[PDB]
Design a protein around this ligand. Sequence first.
Ligand SMILES: NC(=[NH2+])NCCC[C@H](N)C(=O)O
Length: 235
Amino acid sequence: QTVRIGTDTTYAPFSSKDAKGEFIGFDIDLGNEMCKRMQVKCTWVASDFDALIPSLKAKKIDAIISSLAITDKRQQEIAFSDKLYAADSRLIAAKGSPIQPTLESLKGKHVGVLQGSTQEAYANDNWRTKGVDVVAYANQDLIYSDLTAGRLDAALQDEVAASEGFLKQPAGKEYAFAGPSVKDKKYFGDGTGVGLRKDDTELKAAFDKALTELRQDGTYDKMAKKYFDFNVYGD
Ligand SMILES: NC(=[NH2+])NCCC[C@H](N)C(=O)O
């Protein structure tokens, strides 16, 4: 039909808006390229990240492309395409900060996470319970803003989003990663994928076919090179 694809546009370089409100980023490029090969029209629909799976279940959108990690919990509720790219999580803080992604370091500190994210799940279970002030936000822009305002000591999000979308931008010049990637298979998933209703077998097959084809002919790498000088796909 027309495939309606939901995304949250506060996660550069994967999904954001340009100065005239056009959606831009690697998620947008992947979605548009897949749609072309599937020979379908696609309409992008912006929403808060935590609204994406509910909107999909409610049939207000037909697909999610929004750095949506493929997790065990989410697969109980929806289906996923094959992996679009890998996504590790990592903390950021002010440059020179001693902060580490540990309870010892973070107890009593204010740590921002995106509401509805794997980072929120991780932080709520491991940090909020034990006395870290975990603050959950409607979108990632509010997090970066509250961090630069000094209201947050740190923020947890996807590593590549933080790096390319903030640290390497003027806004994040005085900030840096605090500690290494936070690796936990119980939480952050096995890369990201197109989120789909479980019964939409045909639509999943179509996305999967287009994805294989655009990876195979080198289009994936061509598009990825616009944003990344490393292997974003992973293994
Ligand atoms: N467009 C976005 N805001 N994406 C947030 C993704 C965060 C994390 N990868 C998750 O799946 O929960």
